[PDB]
């Protein structure tokens, strides 16, 4: 047994669909079948450090949570400047809670708490994110692909010629 202890699984990247001149940062922003979040969604409570990568322009800049967004461009809370083409940072946890989670039933919109935060620039294209030393708590249900045809399942396989 030398896998499925997250310590090796969740240290990769995953694309994110959306962007804008500002853009919230969260895990549940991930696709709900990208192999990253499946395991993530497959659990109840999880914590990690955090690493992120952005291909961009202008001046990438970031703020931790619980902050007045209205005050980012000014006075430049911490950052380093432009350099193409790869740029790689890591943020440490900041949220007001000793653990994250996936969904919080309270009388189904995601709460306003679990917030790695957001970044801002003048031009933003590509996003890479990363989970460190993570751990998970109370795994949750999980699905596979659905069965439609008869036998067992069918699927194409690569092979040389």
């Amino acid at each position: 047994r030398h896998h499925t202890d997250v310590g090796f699984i969740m240290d990769r990247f995953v694309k994110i669909n959306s962007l804008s001149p500002t853009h919230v940062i969260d895990l549940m922003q991930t696709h709900k079948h990208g192999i990253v979040g499946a395991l993530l969604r497959a659990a109840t409570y999880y914590f990690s450090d955090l690493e992120i990568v952005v291909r961009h322009d202008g001046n990438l800049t970031w703020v931790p949570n619980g902050a007045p967004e209205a005050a980012l461009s000014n006075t430049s809370n911490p950052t380093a400047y432009n350099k193409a083409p790869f740029t790689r940072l890591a943020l440490p946890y900041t949220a007001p809670h000793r653990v994250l989670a996936t969904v919080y039933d309270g009388t189904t919109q995601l709460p306003a708490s679990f917030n790695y935060g957001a970044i801002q620039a003048q031009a933003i294209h590509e996003l890479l994110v990363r989970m460190k030393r993570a751990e998970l708590y109370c795994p949750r249900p999980l699905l596979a692909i659905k069965v439609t045809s008869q036998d067992r399942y069918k699927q194409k396989i690569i092979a040389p010629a």
Partner: protein, 221 residues
């Protein structure tokens, strides 16, 4: 006094698997240590040991239709890592994100009639290529088989040895050949005692052996 700048000729790719790290920035920040919190785990496998599962038949009803009369054949399913018999299955989803896998596989059985009722059943393995499913307990037995009764126990867990071609196999199955990868491994029984309506349950799970190698997305992210 420069040190020889033994520059890099073409390496160092920003790529996926990498183990390289980064620089804390608004850093040097503690957190209240999260020990003593419950629900800790590490292994998809190991948590898939204590937890059993369920199955499915075309009747969409998880339990087994368990006819109780002179019939001899009970019902026959299959156990792939990906098959209609075993979709909604805590293994497969965890599995279907992998290609290499190895080790024994687990099952369960839960009885339904009142304890008084005597009973007989017979789990039985079939290797993928016997070319004919057995049709009698003793000749079924030739591959692999065992017993129990209602007597002295109601639960049970069973296992098929991890037969294969090589000491590993493909998770998904192929569209280039015919022969089933495992067979139709299922159950027989000796004379039913008495029951107006039985029922059977069945699961799978990780155990000492369920292993994997790894990994890639299949899906259409």
């Amino acid at each position: 006094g420069i040190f020889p700048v033994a520059c890099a000729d073409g390496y160092g790719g920003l790529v996926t698997t990498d183990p390289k790290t980064a620089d804390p920035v608004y850093g040097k920040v503690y957190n209240p240590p999260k020990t003593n919190y419950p629900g800790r785990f590490t292994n998809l496998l190991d948590v898939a040991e204590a937890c059993p599962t369920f199955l499915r038949f075309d009747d969409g009803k998880p339990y087994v239709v368990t006819r109780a009369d002179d019939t001899r054949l009970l019902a026959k399913f299959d156990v792939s890592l990906a098959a209609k018999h075993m979709s909604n299955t805590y293994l497969s989803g965890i599995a279907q994100y992998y290609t290499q896998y190895s080790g024994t596989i687990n099952l369960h059985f839960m009885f339904t009639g009142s304890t008084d009722s005597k009973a007989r059943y017979m789990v039985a393995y079939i290797p993928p290529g016997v070319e004919t499913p057995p049709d009698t307990p003793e000749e079924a037995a030739h591959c692999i088989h065992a017993e129990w009764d209602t007597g002295l126990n109601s639960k049970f867990t069973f296992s098929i040895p991890y037969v294969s071609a090589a000491d590993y196999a493909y998770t998904a199955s192929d569209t280039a050949e015919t022969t089933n990868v495992q067979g139709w491994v299922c159950v027989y029984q000796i004379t039913h005692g008495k029951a107006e309506n039985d029922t059977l349950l069945v699961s799978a799970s990780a155990g000492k052996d369920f292993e994997l190698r790894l990994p890639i997305d299949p899906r259409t992210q």
